[PDB]
Symmetry: C5
Subunit: 267 residues, 5 copies
């Protein structure tokens, strides 16, 4: 694809960009941002039609970078190369509120903390994140305003190589439908952890001293095509339990801080 | 001198019908030791695929030839977010609550080798009556619940060797590298990591990776994620596919 | 920011500090605890007392003055290099007889457990904060500093909620987190664990050191000859005989080593 | 101890030995190898006489090495020196059988997996493993077919330095009576982990790529007396629960693969 | 103490020690256990028996004399360099039949579990302690050394509560922690886990060594040719058939290597 050349060093060679990404859990109304719509259980396989507000989606933001080429008709040009990232989950202490709309754990007791299944994930790339579709129930009837696997079949619950896509739209790709495709993503770095179980305790660390290096085995980081940097994220912290017993997913925003350098490439 | 091959391996949990791929049949309990006859669809089996590589020799009567040597592997579990579906055919944790997530006993395992994975048989109940269409330990005896060195086999057939019957044999497998973790308990939470930045090196303490005999590369896997609980309370194993990406180099060997 | 020069040699100094927790302290007899915690309150009518809300702890530590003339092109500042930090009184929770609730007939008291948050920071200036709310319509008490003009977006990103930890027992933990888009002159570390049955796990030692230098080899530079230490140590919930619960906190110790650095002025 | 001199390896200076060790959980009858007899509870401190089949014991095997044919009349001889070991627990997937004689977890549910307290342990030495006795109840009346601490007293529940022994017999030394003695065992390397709690989930890893080095701080591995090697093991995986509710310890076999070299010692 | 560079040689030595636990020992038949534990007691009327309170363990170990005259300007002291340490008798808890409570109909006995605390220290002098109390109004028995003049602040920081571990089986674990603002001549390590259902996790081996040298490359220097070892090993709670509970402890082994160090005086 791209012939990679020398890295420009010294002054006016580096740059930093930052970004706060909101979660996309569903947002049933205006007062419930950060949550999903009350969740439904025990739906029959052949009659499951979930609302969009019940389905958390991938978050994505494209970050525009400074144009580094005065002349786009040259043999050698330069591209921005992502070198490192600091990333952080925002508002973890908010869950120490056990009094607002909570269900008591017992008589005279405090409210039940947010807990259960979770998924924390982030990616950095010079292009949209490439996805592969996998379904728990291939007969699920997904709502309009969501991009899900087309022509879902028997094999969509295992390997169906037809379900390829890219994360090009925010709050559109349901988390439960898509995973990052390991057979692609040559120009993206991604990291995720899934934990399942309704009583699973969230464990969340914060610091400004942790850095992730984005260079590959060749010493090359993601190269930003069209002077665009893509950041993607999912941060399902668990389930919020209402006084009534109804539950909805909780999400939190995510921060990015990426350092890039100029690399020469062949045009 | 170098080359890459990749592979998606489907899980083999049982597949009771075309609408339930990835699942096992409904699991049975409390069966008598002397009368336990499981259906094949109730028994998850090892997955295996043989990958053909480019031919590199021309006269195998020569003293010195080239073989493909497996150097590194990237491997990944496919579809982990699928389990965030808590509405399809699930059982509610409580009145008004969401569905119960997949959980319980699990087993995640992969291997890379220049020949079929060598197995050793061990049985929980040596008197189990295993179905046709499966390869289980022959002439199972009292000692099959501990060490019975007669139960040797190789993983040469997909969806045939029941996971609960066989383990990789540590006294062999000189030409294979394998890795596995078992977790037991009905409430065990699955913990699954994904990334494209993790690489496993396949060279041994001598600096030699698996040498591919007959220009064949073998990949094996089991990925039992846990139990799916139906609304009625009945349960079935859940599995997910596994991806492989192996890098190989040409090596010189005796003949 | 500040352009740094060279380091004084052969020049050092150490400072230490015990920081009390600020869980709420409902009365003179219950230091280290919050007030009894409420549950199941209506989103549009939730008015928590101050004593129910644990707050960030902070202390500003004055350092020796090093300069005679601040018009000089080269000036010296104290540079924080390492810290040892420790949670004080972890064995106190082995008391299962004082005001406890028995786990069963004939059993011992229920140990402190549940959601926890352990956090510390070292910087040459106050810790910079970002506001995030679980419920943006919460009516916070007087005598506390919380996010101003809270809106719909205060439950996710609202970049208007910026603040600094300049006051002890004032900033509720549940309202603020350290701001990763700032804090260039501070190092912070924290872990949150959620769940009412979560077991506390707490290590103690005098052999663990944290290095405070950044990727450039520069530690926090202390502005106005001031060193700031901040902390939260919510260990979990204490369960009274009656079943009513209240947060438990413990003090935190700091031991910081600093060197003189020449700085451009 | 033994006086050793520097290392000098050549050709024909190495060798490997391997071994499968069966577990010794009790074996209540022929059909229940790898299990113990149903366990008792709530027994009185002063009248507690457990059956041998209820008590798991240490496993041990003496392994013969190639005779280096040294005449021990001279001050300088050769001994086998254990350098590395690969070790593995055999048959971990067997516990994925949840249908044979199990107790269901709930209506229409699968059988309850093996779980609870466990202990996994192995040792390699040039002589029998040296043991120290410690008892939970010093007044326990142990069955004749076991080696247990002699003249057990009040202090046998803490430190009683009289209870010294060696692991020289297989299926004789009850696990609950003995631990390896840290004040001895100069010529043995041992490793063990205990986990307590009736609902503890077993976690068991398998691989053929993990090696343990047996050299001490001086760079000397176990020196094998009389051209003999010793391997010891315990692998209590947890409790098996019958349909009725009775429980029995489960064990699994253990594999060893030891590499040795010839070493000069002072005789 | 000002140290000199390291010496060679007849320059080394090893000492070992088995330390019994001090859980309370309610009678001759119940060593390694505490007395049955009380619960739900009133804050203002809580008087624990000594046998209900586990205490720190401590031994002083005498070392070979090395100086003829302690008035000389250049002296030798023993310097602790490494330690191997081990918990003794972990398999004893595989006894689920002696005086146990069954988990269910037909089931085995309930294993020891719950809150635990495992801790050890090596130093050239007694371990220095800081007092912290869960309930400052607790009335401690006369066979114990506890914080004097306990006040409101004894539940957080009260810098008056300083002490040293100079007596075995006298300093209640729930009252004292090692003081991080001192202990320059001691190395300590501890972990607390809280929760009544917490599973004990205990590793044993003879291949693990801890190095006792500080960031300067100096280990504890044994004053008056004496070495101090301290320990706590609360494994959890033992549950009787009746449902009553008592702490369980196990002995701890030490093996320390020392070298002769030149020092100034």
């Amino acid at each position: 694809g791209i012939e990679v050349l020398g890295v420009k060093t010294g002054v006016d060679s580096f740059t930093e960009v930052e970004c706060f990404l909101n979660p996309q859990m569903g947002n049933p109304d205006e007062h419930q941002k950060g949550l999903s719509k009350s969740l439904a259980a025990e739906k029959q396989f052949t009659d499951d039609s979930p609302d969009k507000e019940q389905l958390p989606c991938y978050s994505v933001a494209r970050i525009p970078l400074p144009n580094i080429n005065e002349d786009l008709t040259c043999g050698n040009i330069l591209m921005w190369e992502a070198v490192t990232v600091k990333t952080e989950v925002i508002g973890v202490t908010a869950m120490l509120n056990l009094h607002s709309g909570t269900q008591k754990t017992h008589e005279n007791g405090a409210g039940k903390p947010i807990q259960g299944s979770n998924f924390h994930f982030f990616a950095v790339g010079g292009e949209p994140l490439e996805l592969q579709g996998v379904l728990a129930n291939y007969r699920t009837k997904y709502p309009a305003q969501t991009v899900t696997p087309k022509n879902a079949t028997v094999d969509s619950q295992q390997m169906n190589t037809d379900h390829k896509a890219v994360l090009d739209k925010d709050n559109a790709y349901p988390v439960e439908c898509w995973v990052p495709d390991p057979s692609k993503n040559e120009n993206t770095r991604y990291f995720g952890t899934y934990t399942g179980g309704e009583n699973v305790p969230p464990v969340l660390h914060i610091t400004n001293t942790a850095t992730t290096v984005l260079l590959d085995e060749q010493g090359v980081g993601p190269l930003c095509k069209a002077d665009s940097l893509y950041v993607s994220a999912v941060d399902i912290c668990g389930l919020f339990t209402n006084t009534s017993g109804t539950q909805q997913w909780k999400g939190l925003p995510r921060y990015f801080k990426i350092t890039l350098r100029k690399r020469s490439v062949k045009n």
